Amino acid sequence: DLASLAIYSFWIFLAGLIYYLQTENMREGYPLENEDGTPAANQGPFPLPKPKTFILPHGRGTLTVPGPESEDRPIALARTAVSEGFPHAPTGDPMKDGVGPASWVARRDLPELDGHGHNKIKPMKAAAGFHVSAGKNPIGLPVRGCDLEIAGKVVDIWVDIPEQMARFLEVELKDGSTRLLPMQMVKVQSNRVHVNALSSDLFAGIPTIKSPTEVTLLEEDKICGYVAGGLMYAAPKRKSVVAAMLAEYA
Amino acid sequence: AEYQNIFSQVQVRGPADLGMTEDVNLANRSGVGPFSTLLGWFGNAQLGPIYLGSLGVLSLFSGLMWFFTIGIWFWYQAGWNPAVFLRDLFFFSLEPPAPEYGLSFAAPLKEGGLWLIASFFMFVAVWSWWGRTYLRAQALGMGKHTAWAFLSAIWLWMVLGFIRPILMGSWSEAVPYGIFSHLDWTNNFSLVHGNLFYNPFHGLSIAFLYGSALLFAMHGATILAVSRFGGERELEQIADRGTAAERAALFWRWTMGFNATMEGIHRWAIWMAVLVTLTGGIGILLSGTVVDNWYVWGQNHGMA
Amino acid sequence: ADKSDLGYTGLTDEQAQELHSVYMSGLWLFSAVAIVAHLAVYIWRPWF
Amino acid sequence: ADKSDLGYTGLTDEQAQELHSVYMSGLWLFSAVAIVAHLAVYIWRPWF
Amino acid sequence: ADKSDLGYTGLTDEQAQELHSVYMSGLWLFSAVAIVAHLAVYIWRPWF
Amino acid sequence: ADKSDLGYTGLTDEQAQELHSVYMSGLWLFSAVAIVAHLAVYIWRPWF
Amino acid sequence: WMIFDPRRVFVAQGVFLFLLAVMIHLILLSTPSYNWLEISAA
Amino acid sequence: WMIFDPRRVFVAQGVFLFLLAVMIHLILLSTPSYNWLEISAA
Amino acid sequence: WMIFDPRRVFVAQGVFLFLLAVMIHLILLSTPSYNWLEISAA
Amino acid sequence: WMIFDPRRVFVAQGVFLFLLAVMIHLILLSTPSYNWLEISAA
Amino acid sequence: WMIFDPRRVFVAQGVFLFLLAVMIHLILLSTPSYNWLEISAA
Amino acid sequence: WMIFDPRRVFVAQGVFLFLLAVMIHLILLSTPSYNWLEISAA
Amino acid sequence: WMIFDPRRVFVAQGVFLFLLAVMIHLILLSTPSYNWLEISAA
Amino acid sequence: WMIFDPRRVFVAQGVFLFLLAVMIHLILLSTPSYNWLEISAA
Amino acid sequence: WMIFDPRRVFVAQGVFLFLLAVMIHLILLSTPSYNWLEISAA
Amino acid sequence: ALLSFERKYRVPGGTLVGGNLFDFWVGPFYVGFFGVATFFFAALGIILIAWSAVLQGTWNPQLISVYPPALEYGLGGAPLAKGGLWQIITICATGAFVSWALREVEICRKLGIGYHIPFAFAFAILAYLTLVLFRPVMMGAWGYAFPYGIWTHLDWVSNTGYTYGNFHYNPAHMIAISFFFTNALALALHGALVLSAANPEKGKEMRTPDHEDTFFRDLVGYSIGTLGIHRLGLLLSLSAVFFSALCMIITGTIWFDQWVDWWQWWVKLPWWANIPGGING
């Protein structure tokens, strides 16, 4: 048709594009809030749109995103500097309130639903998935903490169907009160598991699941998030933990 | 035989779970393929089922017969022995009617032979398989975005042997057939049009292919990094922002200087895919009847 | 200690004995004194 | 603790408190000098 | 643990011991050092 | 353990026991090693 | 929401008109007619 | 109200004009007529 | 719902008067018959 | 008040002038007709 | 129901008068037979 | 009941009314046999 | 059975009868001899 | 301690004099016409 | 048990001779000299 | 600057030795212990494109040229602009890339995500550095490299890019495009994947993780999971870098001749050695 023609519909329309896209990327999180709960200093060169249609996956009603941004979940920090930019500091222990590394938020009590008529996640004792018949079978195995010390025995699996991949290692204590712990943070070398995230004297800090079967969405934030709690902090400052944090490969 | 429980990765197998039933069919889905548990403790291990009929036994069969059309022009030169066939499994070659016959299908089986048949069986091997990334995208009630990166993908296929070399009066302007043949054409459209560098359409067609290792070099790293929280389930993180959507919405803001959402990261991933072969769709749709040279196009618009 | 709503911070007088006492170090020595820096400029060398 | 529905702010009367200082008069002398420092240029040098 | 008002930290009385000894005399350990250091730079070598 | 004043830290007089041996004598013998080198470098052989 | 106040006019709106300056300046200072900076000697 | 300076005026706003001052000192020199220090030896 | 206004006229339609203003201004300056403003040289 | 006096006041003036002077040395090294030993060459 | 109505048939109705017009305005303004806005001399 | 009805009559209605017309408009406009609009002086 | 019926019947009439027609409409106009819309003139 | 002793000036100033000496080496060891260690054969 | 009585000798027996003939026929088929399908003509 | 849920994540540390000495948030941008270093490297290298401008003759980014050192000067340096300024941008840019890939680790120890992100820019330091530290280092000097520009190395990738004949002939390269065409094969889908969940046709429920085994199994037949496409999307884009370094670790230092002279060790076989056949015959 022409030598210089189609490009002047490319630097104009397709340049009206990173202005149409970056907003569809700056929805969740925005609008901007400061460090207490207050209309912020700005929003950006790509201002945020008012949310559109999001029909919910399991008839859960009406929620519009960008959605919850305000201060509903509990926050507590002891300020060391007042001007915006410098970090904050926990009041008590940083493993107590949940400020800094271990991150979560208050969600509504409903287990992730998929399809057939039951929750997304269940163990092997309930959802009789795959059993044990012939040969020697490694279900019921000892574990080691980040302090290089025995913690508990994992004796059951949490199975899956659509994605065929187990998710949790239910650590039952001697008390019988079960403690929960995610999947992409564990490494077993030989016969006994060795953890490097949480010591064997900090496992009750992660509270228990009130239902041994229900996997609600309020409770999938700390169980897989507290592992970060001892990834930032643990453990200052001298001695045997320095030979357990630095170096290494995997 | 039993099924092992290796030391924490982990896995438990899936039994007889097909999927959903609303608009698809399931009777043609005859048998769930035998599960190759290839120590499937990393990804998955599931085969079947799938959609069967004639919206399907046409792409395979036209793929086949297109696939069959170029391969016997590899056995044609061999000497009728299977030794030369794998020795030149690539050195053999095949093209359409001569640059002085072109549009004419009247080329015999001797010379400009087996290009009119493969492109005839290809033309029902990808225009009824784009009618299955667009139709099975409704087999339940979903969108069609899957065939909106496939309608700008068979668009670089809508110049190379369709729209250029048919209203240009030449089949030799359509691509040779096989493994080695078409590479004396990826270095033939290059000596000819004056080096396609100063051609910022093929050139900025490349500027949407060097960026799909700038969006996927980090996507398979970062969603493998937020996984220790629970953002691998990409259908409970968008509206119901998960705890892997607060281990990611700060990172790239702090780093390079802009974050996305869990609906947001799939909107730059396919705005660096629907424009790969589109700017090069326009970047082989303008390398023809405009200015034949791009060295004699790169001295008229580019410094002026 | 935690904070509340608009407009901490803010707010006073950590905005009046602080932010008022740090900001005007860029709206005078670069606003009015730059016109004294204009002195050796506003004729060297625009006029030929 | 934070805020409520659209908009807040808002709000009456909080709209004309933080959106009428460097936006109403902040873009008024910017327009004044856009006629003041333009009329001395209306004549030089569109004319030779 | 944190205090109340203006300002911290800090730190009365450290308006004339912390924010004037390594802050205003910094405009002396480099600004006044420039007075004697520049007396052999402005002529090397704008005047060749 | 930290103190109060300036520098503290400091840490008076850890401001004159560690800012002396490697701060002064480190940079004074970085001035007794750098100046001297020039005296075989200034003229060999920028002049050619 | 949508657009706030005290952050744009300090570092962003300061490079919104300066950006709009050099997209006007870099055009009218090179045409074979005007100049008014180089054309003042010869 | 709002905004920040005890963080933004110590090493964040003082070079905001170093964005605008030092980026236009470069253009004022390279010119083979203005110069002010470049062309005076020939 | 589904779309916006306090974001499509305060910052969108207000840039729809600058996006469309200058584009053809230099399309009718590239085509040499108007010019229209260059009264200096002549 | 705020900021840092026992921290970021002896380190905001050590990699800040070195990030405004010694990096600025490179542009007056970008001369090779001036230059403080290239005068022998030109 | 069907497709977006309070979303799809208003703000994207613009590109029906925007992108459609412009590309058909493309292969038209150039042809030395049309031009129409180049006619000046007579 | 195996496929759709609603979605075809608004968004997939264009691929039979426009794209069919627009990529066919180009070929009949070109051939120096019709013109209508390239007639001008004929 | 295996399959449903009465909803594909508005697209198997929609775009089907032209998926058979478009390719056959493109071979009879290529020959300069016939054309019928190009030759019924002189 | 005003600054850090066994942290900022036992090896970190060792990459301060080292960050200066060698970046200029490949300016003085270089240069098209100095060398006096390379050009001794030709 | 151990040997497929039902599984191998009906459905896998078909593809055994099938493959034992397919690309071995593609050896001495239409050879330069033999042929015996191109011969009984000229 | 911070998001609405960025009230809590704000915690110091992360950096290596010394303290929070460098770790201050400036804007949305993270300025950590590798922060005023990347401010140091950035405000030092943009003028390293403007240095080779007063000498070469081109200030414009069109044809700015800081050429690689001459092919024959040795293990030392070069002239000025033709290798010297080239050798100045050598530890300014490569000084910045890892003032940033271990400053990402100043955001990975700070929280507790997977250490897999400071790992994918690392292949960007395994195809670039297959051009400075690898090939130029051995066969003589830094002369076996390219000019820095945006265009200069283009007509360097073209004209001086047929020196091994026809490069499609290269088998390390071929298969460092065969991971560069499937690069975008598993993204044009994966990208449409999680848009059609929330927004189907209009008003229809959002989808769940079991409509992925009735679509992609309803597609090509394979379904390695929902996190099995962030582990076959990193099998797409990182590997177009070290099988490309492969035909830049074997190409010029071992086989500086044609690599179309490579596909004639497939016919030299005692089976079909003295007996040609197809095409060749």
Ligand code: BCL
């Ligand atoms: C516009 C310029 C040319 C062209 C430029 C190039 C260049 C450059 C390259 C190719 C390459 C390829 N091209 Mg091509 N190609 C064109 C456009 C096409 C189109 C199309 C129009 O839709 C198709 C179907 C193809 C087909 C192909 C593949 C066979 C091959 C690898 C692509 C890839 O990365 O997928 C990989 C993933 C897939 C799922 C595709 C499946 C194909 C298999 C997996 C790869 C084939 C490797 C080899 C030939 C097989 C040998 C097996 C032997 C028995 C040992 N090309 C046009 C005609 N194309 C690459 C190549 O290596 O060529 C041989 C290559 O570098």
Ligand code: BCL
């Ligand atoms: C001198 C060398 C020139 C040059 C010479 C050429 C030539 C010649 C060509 C290109 C083209 C292109 N160049 Mg170039 N190019 C140069 C520099 C580069 C560089 C670089 C060194 O940075 C790169 C990475 C590229 C690569 C590219 C691409 C951006 C572009 C083709 C896109 C494509 O292939 O997708 C194609 C993908 C598709 C069409 C999708 C497939 C759709 C089909 C219909 C579906 C069939 C799938 C099939 C069923 C699969 C079967 C699966 C089986 C079941 C296994 N060029 C230099 C400057 N380049 C090509 C182009 O088109 O220009 C824009 C082209 O012809």
Ligand code: BCL
């Ligand atoms: C005869 C022509 C040859 C050919 C000529 C060449 C030449 C010459 C080369 C290649 C190279 C490659 N070719 Mg080839 N190539 C051919 C045609 C093709 C086609 C095609 C479709 O036809 C394709 C897809 C390719 C693709 C490939 C890759 C396998 C390989 C480049 C790897 C890479 O980019 O990562 C590597 C990534 C990097 C080097 C980037 C490093 C990351 C850095 C750290 C980040 C930069 C940051 C930046 C400075 C800052 C900017 C950001 C802003 C601040 C915002 N070639 C034909 C067969 N090809 C290159 C190669 O193999 O060497 C490795 C190469 O030199």
Ligand SMILES: CC[C@H]1c2cc3[nH]c4c(c3C)C(=O)[C@H](C(=O)OC)c4c3nc(cc4[nH]c(cc(n2)[C@@H]1C)c(C(C)=O)c4C)[C@@H](C)[C@@H]3CCC(=O)OC/C=C(\C)CCC[C@H](C)CCC[C@H](C)CCCC(C)C
């Ligand atoms: C196989 C690896 C693939 C890959 C992965 C990858 N790239 C990445 C990342 C990852 C994971 C990031 O996390 C980081 C990022 O921010 O995300 C986009 C990045 C990045 N990839 C970028 C670019 C890039 N990556 C490329 C390629 C690739 N990246 C590969 C395909 C390419 C091409 C096309 O080759 C480019 C141009 C940057 C946007 C960003 C790197 C951010 C960064 O590290 O910044 C540091 C730089 C400075 C502080 C500036 C100082 C440098 C000097 C001042 C000047 C430098 C001189 C030099 C010659 C520059 C010239 C550039 C061009 C003219 C060549």
Ligand SMILES: CC[C@H]1c2cc3[nH]c4c(c3C)C(=O)[C@H](C(=O)OC)c4c3nc(cc4[nH]c(cc(n2)[C@@H]1C)c(C(C)=O)c4C)[C@@H](C)[C@@H]3CCC(=O)OC/C=C(\C)CCC[C@H](C)CCC[C@H](C)CCCC(C)C
């Ligand atoms: C945005 C540009 C990117 C892109 C996009 C893209 N590619 C796509 C798509 C999209 C949206 C699809 O929707 C479609 C797809 O379904 O992906 C899996 C596809 C696709 N892209 C593919 C490849 C591909 N991707 C490419 C690249 C790219 N595609 C870019 C990176 C290229 C290049 C570079 O040219 C190619 C060649 C395929 C994986 C797939 C195309 C699916 C298809 O059309 O196949 C139809 C099915 C057949 C032809 C079956 C026949 C099989 C053989 C032909 C017969 C021989 C085997 C047979 C089994 C004989 C044995 C006998 C038996 C009966 C026993």
Ligand SMILES: [Fe+2]
């Ligand atoms: Fe993904």
